[PDB]
Design a protein around this ligand. Sequence first.
Ligand SMILES: CN(C)c1cc(CNCC(C)(C)C)c(O)c2c1C[C@H]1C[C@H]3[C@H](N(C)C)C(=O)C(C(N)=O)=C(O)[C@@]3(O)C(=O)C1=C2O
Ligand SMILES: CN[C@@H]1[C@H](O)[C@H](NC)[C@H]2O[C@@]3(O)C(=O)C[C@@H](C)O[C@H]3O[C@@H]2[C@H]1O
Ligand SMILES: [K+]
Ligand SMILES: [K+]
Ligand SMILES: [K+]
Ligand SMILES: [K+]
Ligand SMILES: [K+]
Ligand SMILES: [K+]
Ligand SMILES: [K+]
Ligand SMILES: [K+]
Ligand SMILES: [K+]
Ligand SMILES: [K+]
Ligand SMILES: [K+]
Ligand SMILES: [K+]
Ligand SMILES: [K+]
Ligand SMILES: [K+]
Ligand SMILES: [Mg+2]
Ligand SMILES: [Mg+2]
Ligand SMILES: [Mg+2]
Ligand SMILES: [Mg+2]
Ligand SMILES: [Mg+2]
Ligand SMILES: [Mg+2]
Ligand SMILES: [Mg+2]
Ligand SMILES: [Mg+2]
Ligand SMILES: [Mg+2]
Ligand SMILES: [Mg+2]
Ligand SMILES: [Mg+2]
Ligand SMILES: [Mg+2]
Ligand SMILES: [Mg+2]
Ligand SMILES: [Mg+2]
Ligand SMILES: [Mg+2]
Ligand SMILES: [Mg+2]
Ligand SMILES: [Mg+2]
Ligand SMILES: [Mg+2]
Ligand SMILES: [Mg+2]
Ligand SMILES: [Mg+2]
Ligand SMILES: [Mg+2]
Ligand SMILES: [Mg+2]
Ligand SMILES: [Mg+2]
Ligand SMILES: [Mg+2]
Ligand SMILES: [Mg+2]
Ligand SMILES: [Mg+2]
Lengths: 206, 36, 101, 113, 84, 125, 83, 100
Amino acid sequence: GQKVHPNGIRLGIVKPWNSTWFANTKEFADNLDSDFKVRQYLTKELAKASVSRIVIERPAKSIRVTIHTARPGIVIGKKGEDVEKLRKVVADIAGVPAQINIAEVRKPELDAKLVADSITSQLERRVMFRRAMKRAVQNAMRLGAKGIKVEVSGRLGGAEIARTEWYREGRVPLHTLRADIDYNTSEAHTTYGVIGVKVWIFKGEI
Amino acid sequence: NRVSKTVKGGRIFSFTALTGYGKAREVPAAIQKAME
Amino acid sequence: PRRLPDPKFGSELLAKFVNILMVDGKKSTAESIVYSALETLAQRSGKSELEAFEVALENVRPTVEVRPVRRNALAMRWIVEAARKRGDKSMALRLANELSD
Amino acid sequence: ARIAGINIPDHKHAVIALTSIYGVGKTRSKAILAAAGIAEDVKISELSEGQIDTLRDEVAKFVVEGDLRREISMSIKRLMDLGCYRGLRHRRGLPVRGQRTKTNARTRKGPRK
Amino acid sequence: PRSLKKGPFIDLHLLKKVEKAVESGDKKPLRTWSRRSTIFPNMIGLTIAVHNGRQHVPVFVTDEMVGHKLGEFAPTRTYRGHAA
Amino acid sequence: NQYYGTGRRKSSAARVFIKPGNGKIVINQRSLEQYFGRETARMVVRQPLELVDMVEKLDLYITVKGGGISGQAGAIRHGITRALMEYDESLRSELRKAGFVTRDARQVERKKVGLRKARRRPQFS
Amino acid sequence: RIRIRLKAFDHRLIDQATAEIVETAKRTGAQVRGPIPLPTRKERFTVLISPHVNKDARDQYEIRTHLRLVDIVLAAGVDVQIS
Amino acid sequence: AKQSMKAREVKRVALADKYFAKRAELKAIISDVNASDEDRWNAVLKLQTLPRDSSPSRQRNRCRQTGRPHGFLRKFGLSRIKVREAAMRGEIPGLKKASW
RNA sequence: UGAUCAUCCAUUGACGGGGGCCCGCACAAGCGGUGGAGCAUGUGGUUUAAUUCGAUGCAACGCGAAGAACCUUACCUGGUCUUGACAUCCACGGAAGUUUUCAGAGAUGAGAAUGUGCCUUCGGGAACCGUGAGACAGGUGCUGCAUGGCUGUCGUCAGCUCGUGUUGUGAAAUGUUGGGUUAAGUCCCGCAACGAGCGCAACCCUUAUCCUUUGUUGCCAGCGGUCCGGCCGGGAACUCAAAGGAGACUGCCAGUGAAAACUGGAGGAAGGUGGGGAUGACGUCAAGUCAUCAUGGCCCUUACGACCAGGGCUACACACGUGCUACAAUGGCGCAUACAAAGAGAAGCGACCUCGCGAGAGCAAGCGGACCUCAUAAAGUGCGUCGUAGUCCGGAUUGGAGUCUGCAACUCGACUCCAUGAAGUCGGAAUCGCUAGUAAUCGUGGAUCAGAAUGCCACGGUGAAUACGUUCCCGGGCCUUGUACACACCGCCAAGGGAUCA
Ligand SMILES: CN(C)c1cc(CNCC(C)(C)C)c(O)c2c1C[C@H]1C[C@H]3[C@H](N(C)C)C(=O)C(C(N)=O)=C(O)[C@@]3(O)C(=O)C1=C2O
Ligand SMILES: CN[C@@H]1[C@H](O)[C@H](NC)[C@H]2O[C@@]3(O)C(=O)C[C@@H](C)O[C@H]3O[C@@H]2[C@H]1O
Ligand SMILES: [K+]
Ligand SMILES: [K+]
Ligand SMILES: [K+]
Ligand SMILES: [K+]
Ligand SMILES: [K+]
Ligand SMILES: [K+]
Ligand SMILES: [K+]
Ligand SMILES: [K+]
Ligand SMILES: [K+]
Ligand SMILES: [K+]
Ligand SMILES: [K+]
Ligand SMILES: [K+]
Ligand SMILES: [K+]
Ligand SMILES: [K+]
Ligand SMILES: [Mg+2]
Ligand SMILES: [Mg+2]
Ligand SMILES: [Mg+2]
Ligand SMILES: [Mg+2]
Ligand SMILES: [Mg+2]
Ligand SMILES: [Mg+2]
Ligand SMILES: [Mg+2]
Ligand SMILES: [Mg+2]
Ligand SMILES: [Mg+2]
Ligand SMILES: [Mg+2]
Ligand SMILES: [Mg+2]
Ligand SMILES: [Mg+2]
Ligand SMILES: [Mg+2]
Ligand SMILES: [Mg+2]
Ligand SMILES: [Mg+2]
Ligand SMILES: [Mg+2]
Ligand SMILES: [Mg+2]
Ligand SMILES: [Mg+2]
Ligand SMILES: [Mg+2]
Ligand SMILES: [Mg+2]
Ligand SMILES: [Mg+2]
Ligand SMILES: [Mg+2]
Ligand SMILES: [Mg+2]
Ligand SMILES: [Mg+2]
Ligand SMILES: [Mg+2]
Ligand SMILES: [Mg+2]
């Protein structure tokens, strides 16, 4: 049957929020919609730059966007050229002053979003799905995940009948609330249609 | 040689490869077992 | 499955009786009806209100063998059921008349 | 008593007994009684003959009985002659005030044909 | 019903239509979609062709009609019985 | 000297101040019989002092907030027993044997999605 | 009187921000009357989780808005109204 | 929702803001106790001749992401579906699964 | 072969009416309902110009819709537009925009004034408009049986598997079975298995007790007054608020047991999972959703796209589902008078006061709230009245007269006033919910929302009855056996109406 979102259920238990501002009802919806337009802009611009997470704070008349990226050199650029010109667009979008900070994902093979994006990248190059899945699981366990599960669903290998296929290695205890389960998804847009990727990475209990 | 076990609601398709004699849900694992 | 004293007389049997008579949680409404009925009963009989109530139960109490908790439970349920059917004007008097009979 | 062609019940309170007149509900009743100056809860039997004449007086201020029935009948008859939507609902014997007819509407329609 | 404070609603386009009909003394049917417009006294004697959703239904205005809406005289749904 | 106890029952909370005397009962600046109408309430408030045989030896100023008549009477009783245990701790065992020292923890179970109430399901056909 | 109202969606965050204003006011010689935990608003929301039908399938969410007052006789996402 | 329907909502918001004060003025005459019947009559006939879409009640709250006109929630500005997706991704501050 | 060897007038499953052992408000025991009535609401059908589309046994039918008068709106009728309502790109025109005029249902068209700013290499503009261009936009069109995502369902049931080893020619088997035990593949013991993964449990939220900290907007025990109101000076006790701790472990005791556990006892606010919630294994039904969104393919492109007004989604011989209100006296009515919790609020909640019979209106404080407002809890209790009547029960329906929201309540709102006073007198076969602060009943609040709940989501008050038991019905678990089933009994022979022997 259907399952609770692993990130959602653990918010405030072991997982932090990605938006951390305060607002009253009058400012709340506008802040969500500006946050949406910020995250949308950056996800597009930094499609090649290995973006895992976009954390948004809003201090006193400001937006602070922290971009968690495995390739900070690509995001930052030369003399912080690229940081500064993202920062203008974010400040335009949010309609307030903006700092962009660039945080580094040191182990991208342990980042659920980066792993999911890698698989969907490979699926769109017409890499065989089983190979892409196996490589993800092996990489994460090599780099010291206590477990990983990868699910791929859709018209796998352009088959007529859609299928779900998954591999797991190690522990992925989804009912354990204190389990540090990084969970994220991605979509591969193929010639045959959408294939969904789901990745769960377990990094010990807290 | 693909073989099958029936279960409630379907069938589990498995593979066997006469190289020894192994058995696995994937083909390459069956070879590794059979070679071992 | 597969695996409190009434505050006027100290008889839990009457506390049960209030509960059987009670409808919709209205326990104070039930209590008044029963006490009114017991004093009425006593005036047209001449005992302490439990003795007449207990003699009234003895005639109803059914004897597969009924065990004595279900026995008094059935009696009281049948009394209340019998009382509610009648064409006396209030439930207090319906109950008093049914208990008398 | 007899007030406006209706034999008003003698063993009822004046407030209640007066509602037996068509065109007189509970509030017009209490209005009549407090104007004529009889208590609501006094029985119609107990009133002296002069007091009934005062009750008969206060009801003549209102439209009642066959005056009202003509008045009601004329209102409904105007609608049908007018041939407005309300009049068509009167004509067909359906709900007049926008109610559901897919189900229910049995007060107006009668029992199921 | 509309509050007495606010008075009676008619559409301005219709109020002008009806005035022009009186001034000129024309009896050619006045075509309107304003079902929600109240019938005023100066309507009397005009035929007002009221839209019912597909057709303009003529309403020769009478004195009994005044105070009612125009759309009261243009039924929208067609029903001629079931099993018939 | 006053010996205090809090009492609680459903959504009710009761502040009870016992001290020696002839046996007045104030509940929110009203007598017992003005405050509580029902005789089930009034027994329940005297149950503890009836038990310990100190009906006419102890005055009682009570405040009570929240809940209803039986809840508040139950809150009051809890507080009187809690006040008595502060006065004399020989009375604990006997008051516990009367079942008074227990905070009746039974509360209104919440309404739930798909059910009309806490447990009442909608009708099936 | 300097009267400090703090709101936050997180209670660890509000107690820290409180502790900054409070201890800082204590350092100077302003008479801090103690920090007062006011009632947390638990705002609640119930949504259908299916895109279509399945009316009994729902999620229930809550935002807890924590509230602190401190009288005198910061982290982004802590609210501050000093009157 | 279709692109046209989202664009209808934009147009209605803009006209509501354009005529807000002009609508408020004309309505205030119609509500007023102490006024002429001629000015009131005029004021009734002016309020109708404005764009219908300048009335605020012609606006439907839509999901800001999708345009869905059902299941809207005011605090988030989103439908039930996009609220849920954002909630579970940790994108709505303070919002967590509730139990009590 | 699954695999293996005009009009009203041999293996694995599955299955058995084969066997054994179990569980769940499944039955039983109860309590209250549904089915009858009126009405609300959804659906079918029928009707219609249209009655938009979707959901269809359990698991569709107060379901998507947390709110269809216009809008929403997808539908119909009619009026309209064609690079376009919504984007980018290019040429050319041009500041944006502020008023009003006429025609038109409006869309829109034709005007006529007014403003002609501001960035600024005085070099330009880029802001936002218009005309033209064709690359394209657009589609709630089709396929949920091409898909992702999300969801229902078995069911919070105790299952489902793998590695390595061992056994079998092999499909496979073992572990996972067995003896107990448990809410539980829970735990223990035995055991060719040894371990592990996903489920169970725990970690999470809330509720029941205490403690520390803190003390306003909350609080009032002791003081000092009092306009007798925590109203004021005060107090920090107490209620409470909400941070941080403590607490429950079968830990203790006794008995039973071959150990796990079970049964009772102490203490304790709480006792065996304390109560409630969140949490939904591998899979099952080509289950639901291309109309939230996304998306392969197909299809439409002066139309299947787009704009407008009016109509429809509210139709009514009828059938079905879910509700509300009743049929009274355990009650109705009148008067007086107690005790809640939880929540919402800025184009918002709106007091006091004045006016209105009332819905409401006027005036106008306060409150982005422990302060102000919504905002009298109701059932209760007391006293009075009605006296078993189709009633002083019921409140349907209809007439007249209003109020309010809204450009607008004709189709088609809610509410009030006066009048009216229908069916209904406890509901056939059949059928539903519930095991305790539950059911039942009583109010209260909230989301959607201009307005529009009898629905939904939450909150307290009062507050039961009954459970001997598992034979039977329904769903499910484990083991074993028969099988001509594998689309898997909705099958194509089970005890087939050889099994069965516990
Ligand atoms: C003609 N057939 C075989 C068929 C064919 C297709 C493919 N083409 C369909 C279409 C293009 C709409 C003509 C289909 O897509 C489908 C079905 C069967 C239905 C049956 C339906 C049924 N009723 C609702 C009617 C039911 O209760 C059950 C059930 N399992 O209980 C179902 O499976 C269904 O819901 C269903 O989903 C179907 C199909 O998809
Ligand atoms: C009552 N719940 C059942 C039960 O747990 C079944 N196992 C005995 C279980 O079996 C499965 O796991 C299966 O193996 C087969 C599938 C159709 O159902 C799955 O879900 C089945 C569950 O739905
Ligand atoms: K719509
Ligand atoms: K799907
Ligand atoms: K063999
Ligand atoms: K094995
Ligand atoms: K379905
Ligand atoms: K498609
Ligand atoms: K309409
Ligand atoms: K209708
Ligand atoms: K209903
Ligand atoms: K019904
Ligand atoms: K009557
Ligand atoms: K209407
Ligand atoms: K069997
Ligand atoms: K045979
Ligand atoms: Mg009458
Ligand atoms: Mg309740
Ligand atoms: Mg429902
Ligand atoms: Mg779209
Ligand atoms: Mg609206
Ligand atoms: Mg039964
Ligand atoms: Mg019925
Ligand atoms: Mg089906
Ligand atoms: Mg419409
Ligand atoms: Mg499907
Ligand atoms: Mg098994
Ligand atoms: Mg286990
Ligand atoms: Mg074993
Ligand atoms: Mg669990
Ligand atoms: Mg014990
Ligand atoms: Mg299908
Ligand atoms: Mg379908
Ligand atoms: Mg569709
Ligand atoms: Mg329209
Ligand atoms: Mg409808
Ligand atoms: Mg009545
Ligand atoms: Mg509200
Ligand atoms: Mg609040
Ligand atoms: Mg009759
Ligand atoms: Mg149970
Ligand atoms: Mg078992």
